[PDB]
Amino acid sequence: VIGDFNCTNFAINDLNTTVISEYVVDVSYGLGTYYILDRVYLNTTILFTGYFPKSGANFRDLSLKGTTYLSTLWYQKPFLSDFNNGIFSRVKNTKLYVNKTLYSEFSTIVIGSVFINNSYTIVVQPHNGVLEITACQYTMCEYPHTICKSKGSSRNESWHFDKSEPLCLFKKNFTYNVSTDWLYFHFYQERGTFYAYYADSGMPTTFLFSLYLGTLLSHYYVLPLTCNAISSNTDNETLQYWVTPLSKRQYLLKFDNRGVITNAVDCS
Ligand SMILES: *[C@@H]1O[C@H](CO)[C@@H](O[C@@H]2O[C@H](CO)[C@@H](O[C@@H]3O[C@H](CO[C@H]4O[C@H](CO)[C@@H](O)[C@H](O)[C@@H]4O)[C@@H](O)[C@H](O[C@H]4O[C@H](CO)[C@@H](O)[C@H](O)[C@@H]4O)[C@@H]3O)[C@H](O)[C@H]2NC(C)=O)[C@H](O)[C@H]1NC(C)=O
Ligand SMILES: *[C@@H]1O[C@H](CO)[C@@H](O[C@@H]2O[C@H](CO)[C@@H](O)[C@H](O)[C@H]2NC(C)=O)[C@H](O)[C@H]1NC(C)=O
Numbered sequence: 001v002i003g004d005f006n007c008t009n010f011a012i013n014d015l016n017t018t019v020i021s022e023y024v025v026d027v028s029y030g031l032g033t034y035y036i037l038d039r040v041y042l043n044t045t046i047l048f049t050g051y052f053p054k055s056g057a058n059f060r061d062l063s064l065k066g067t068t069y070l071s072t073l074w075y076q077k078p079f080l081s082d083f084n085n086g087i088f089s090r091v092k093n094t095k096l097y098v099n100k101t102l103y104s105e106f107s108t109i110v111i112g113s114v115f116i117n118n119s120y121t122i123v124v125q126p127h128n129g130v131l132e133i134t135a136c137q138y139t140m141c142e143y144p145h146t147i148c149k150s151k152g153s154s155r156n157e158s159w160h161f162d163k164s165e166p167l168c169l170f171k172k173n174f175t176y177n178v179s180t181d182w183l184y185f186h187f188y189q190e191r192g193t194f195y196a197y198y199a200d201s202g203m204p205t206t207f208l209f210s211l212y213l214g215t216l217l218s219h220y221y222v223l224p225l226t227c228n229a230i231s232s233n234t235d236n237e238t239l240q241y242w243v244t245p246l247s248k249r250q251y252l253l254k255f256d257n258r259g260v261i262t263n264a265v266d267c268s
């Protein structure tokens, strides 16, 4: 389980027939890199040490799409994952349509330790062009999940059950371009402070925020999304949420004559 609160008994089983899809990290076009502090480098190559993916390591696609039933096995290892120093995410923006109006969906991620309301859980959730980010003492469900608010779902949304508002260290919204095909994120921790970088356009990420927690984060989980759409019998659309571990690595970075990181090399 994530959490421990019994949010519902409705339509749960032990279905085993789901496996992690995997793909190979390739930073040669600047994927997995980020812009350095407030600096601009031009038409040059730099050696820099930062929280980066290992080149040639695997990404794991942790996105889960459901329709009605939830497997208990989705709420365990290998999906419930160790956070260590941090993670890099490559996220497909699943662009749906209703009456020729565009809607943007992708999986929520939660980052935490015990997921009990005596500890802070970070949550990053899309709301169709608004990225809502919070860090609160959420009463996380045993079996948390989200819904397609655009197309609808056979079950209600539930990932926490707080009746009164919980205590929060952080709560902000960031806009993102709903038309882009991919979002990139770095989430990492150093000396009890969490750091988030993202990009909605291009591959190199840029700083969103940092947050003092004092405590070590230890786990992350990508919430199942339940939808009446997003499948081969209705639209051929898919979720994808690729993650890979960060570590403190030395990279070569190449900046063009307008300060964009165009290429990188993991030196080991
Ligand atoms: C912070 O987060 C913690 C969890 O980490 C929350 O603590 C839980 O809170 C819930 C809701 O109050 C508790 O659930 C309720 O427990 C009652 C007592 O359980 C005993 O009695 C039942 C029989 O009634 C036995 O089966 C059981 O083994 C225990 O011996 C139950 O009486 C409640 O059931 C009633 O309400 C539900 C509501 O859905 C109905 O469906 C039932 O029919 C029935 O009417 C209910 O189960 C839970 O026990 C708490 N857990 C712990 C570990 O304390 C905190 O509430 C939360 N704090 C804040 C501020 O949000
Ligand atoms: C951040 O974005 C969220 C999601 O859009 C906003 O939450 C909604 O706010 C309206 C107006 O108060 C409510 O009617 C909705 O019920 C809220 N939830 C959802 C899921 O839409 C939120 O107001 C924004 N701002 C902040 C500071 O959180």
Ligand SMILES: *[C@@H]1O[C@H](CO)[C@@H](O)[C@H](O)[C@H]1NC(C)=O
Pocket: 006, 008, 009
């Ligand atoms: C969860 O809640 C329902 C309704 O109260 C109950 O029937 C079910 O036995 C509960 N399961 C657990 C593990 O608490």
Ligand SMILES: *[C@@H]1O[C@H](CO)[C@@H](O)[C@H](O)[C@H]1NC(C)=O
Pocket: 016
């Ligand atoms: C579930 O899948 C795992 C991993 O392949 C396997 O070890 C296990 O025996 C399976 N159990 C059932 C009942 O399918």
Ligand SMILES: *[C@@H]1O[C@H](CO)[C@@H](O)[C@H](O)[C@H]1NC(C)=O
Pocket: 043, 257
């Ligand atoms: C960029 O750097 C290369 C290598 O020094 C040089 O040949 C080129 O003229 C430079 N171009 C600009 C626009 O600075």
Ligand SMILES: *[C@@H]1O[C@H](CO)[C@@H](O)[C@H](O)[C@H]1NC(C)=O
Pocket: 008, 010, 154, 155, 156
């Ligand atoms: C969803 O919420 C509505 C309104 O509270 C309720 O009527 C319905 O029974 C709920 N269904 C489930 C599966 O939770």
Ligand SMILES: *[C@@H]1O[C@H](CO)[C@@H](O)[C@H](O)[C@H]1NC(C)=O
Pocket: 177, 178, 179, 180, 181, 201
């Ligand atoms: C949004 O993304 C699309 C596709 O990448 C791009 O054509 C468009 O210019 C972007 N708009 C904004 C405001 O960034």
Ligand SMILES: *[C@@H]1O[C@H](CO)[C@@H](O)[C@H](O)[C@H]1NC(C)=O
Pocket: 232, 233, 234, 235, 236
């Ligand atoms: C999904 O793609 C396949 C191959 O093109 C096609 O047979 C199928 O009908 C498509 N499904 C929908 C809902 O269009």
